[PDB]
């Protein structure tokens, strides 16, 4: 999923699928 | 109220360009000329009396959009204490025009103009008015090819029956133009294309 995407890893992790799109993955 | 007197005048002085570019008058005024060029006529009937009936025909299906903005803007709640709530109120008035434009414009082209769904927010009014006019000129060209097509056959068949005889040095425009318009009056094509042109936007 994270080929060209920017994302934050750690406790509060998410993946920005777009400049205006957030994806919160369930553990 | 005094600033609204400007915008009320500013619509009126700009009307013959918005009606020139933002309604179905361009499609009516374009098909009514190529039917003359299809028949091989130049100045008959005019450019004035074809624009007049195209204006009234476009004024039928366009009047209820223009009519609702009156009764919506006559209401007493134009006094608002907030700047942005009045900006919302004038945004809530133009939705009769926006829903008219999105129906006949292309979503990909207005997305292109938007870069430089639609239920939560409507796209801006300047992002789609050329996309509407550029869609109407294309659709009027496409429907212009169709009714051009049967008069080519009468143009060809009498030139082939004259070439079937030996008379090859004979101008067939003086003979086809009689046969051209009887095809248009035995069809009674004038009273029926104005029907389906009205039915293309307004339902029965």
């Amino acid at each position: 999923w994270l080929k060209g995407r920017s994302f934050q890893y750690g406790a509060e992790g998410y993946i920005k699928m777009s400049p205006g799109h957030w994806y919160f993955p369930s553990p | 109220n005094d600033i609204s007197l400007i915008a009320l005048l500013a619509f009126s002085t700009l009307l013959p360009f918005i009606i020139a570019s933002g309604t179905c008058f361009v499609k009516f005024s374009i098909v009514f000329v190529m039917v003359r060029n299809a028949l091989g006529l130049q100045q008959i009937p005019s450019n004035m009396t074809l624009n007049g009936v195209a204006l009234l025909l476009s004024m039928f299906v366009m009047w209820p959009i223009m009519h609702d903005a009156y009764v919506y803007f006559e209401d007493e709640d134009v006094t608002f204490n907030d700047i942005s709530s009045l900006s919302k109120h004038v945004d809530e008035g133009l939705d009769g025009y926006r829903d008219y434009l999105i129906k006949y414009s292309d979503r990909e082209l207005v997305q292109f103009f938007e870069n430089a769904k639609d239920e939560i927010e409507k796209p801006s009014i300047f992002a789609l008015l050329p996309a509407y006019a550029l869609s109407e000129i294309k659709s009027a060209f496409k429907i212009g090819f169709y009714l051009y097509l049967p008069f080519v056959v009468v143009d060809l068949v009498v030139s082939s029956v004259l070439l079937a005889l030996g008379m090859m040095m004979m101008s067939p425009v003086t003979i086809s133009t009689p046969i051209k318009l009887v095809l248009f009056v035995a069809l009674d094509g004038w009273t029926l294309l104005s029907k389906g042109l009205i039915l293309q936007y307004m339902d029965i």
Binding site: - | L9, S12, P16, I19, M48, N51, G52, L55
Partner: protein, 89 residues
Amino acid sequence: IGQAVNIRSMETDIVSLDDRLLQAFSGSAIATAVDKQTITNRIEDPNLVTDPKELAISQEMISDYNLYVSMVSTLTRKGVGAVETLLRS
């Protein structure tokens, strides 16, 4: 000097745009005829024009009468001017 108001503004169906315009014309010609005869009966009664309080009232009815018919004149002028440019093309 004892007044009356009417409260019913009736509605008849329009059968066309031509049927709409006849009501809008007859509704405006009555108001412009009545207000000018109001200001004449205000003037021709001479006890109304000698009092200080009624004069700003007649000033208001003057300035509304001027602004009303001037606003319908320029608007109909720009309306038919919008017709002429489209018909010229």
